[PDB]
Amino acid sequence: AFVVTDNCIKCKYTDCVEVCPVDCFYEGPNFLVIHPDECIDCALCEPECPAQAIFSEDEVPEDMQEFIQLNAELAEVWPNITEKKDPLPDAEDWDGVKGKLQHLER
Numbered sequence: 613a614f615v616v617t618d619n620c621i622k623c624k625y626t627d628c629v630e631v632c633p634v635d636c637f638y639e640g641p642n643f644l645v646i647h648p649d650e651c652i653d654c655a656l657c658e659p660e661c662p663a664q665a666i667f668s669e670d671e672v673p674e675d676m677q678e679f680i681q682l683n684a685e686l687a688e689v690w691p692n693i694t695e696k697k698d699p700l701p702d703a704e705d706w707d708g709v710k711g712k713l714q715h716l717e718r
């Protein structure tokens with residue numbers, strides 16, 4: 613599985629879904645996650661994310677390890693997203709801001 617980490621939050625560019633061959637992205641109000649059972653680890657989305665939020669599970673930074681389970685959990689309850697949309701309005705402002713997990717919306 614690949615995993616969406618902190619920097620997506622309040623950015624949510626949704627560039628990543630456009631290259632996903634298996635459509636395993638699931639949508640929250642201000643964040644996307646990858647369904648780990650669905651992901652085929654093609655790695656195609658990693659270079660697509662402007663926020664550079666996506667990692668191979670085995671390359672998730674130690675300080676963002678919580679994101680792994682969080683992706684798996686939210687992927688069970690959020691709706692599939694398979695089409696790019698406008699990035700969130702103040703995305704440029706939040707890109708690069710750390711600890712955005714405190715802003716995650718269910």
Ligand code: SF4
Nearest residue numbers: 632651652654655657
């Ligand atoms: S690694 Fe491939 S299959 Fe998994 S989320 Fe990214 S694009 Fe989709």
Ligand code: F3S
Nearest residue numbers: 620625626627628661
């Ligand atoms: S900001 Fe999030 S919505 Fe996709 S293109 Fe990056 S993981």
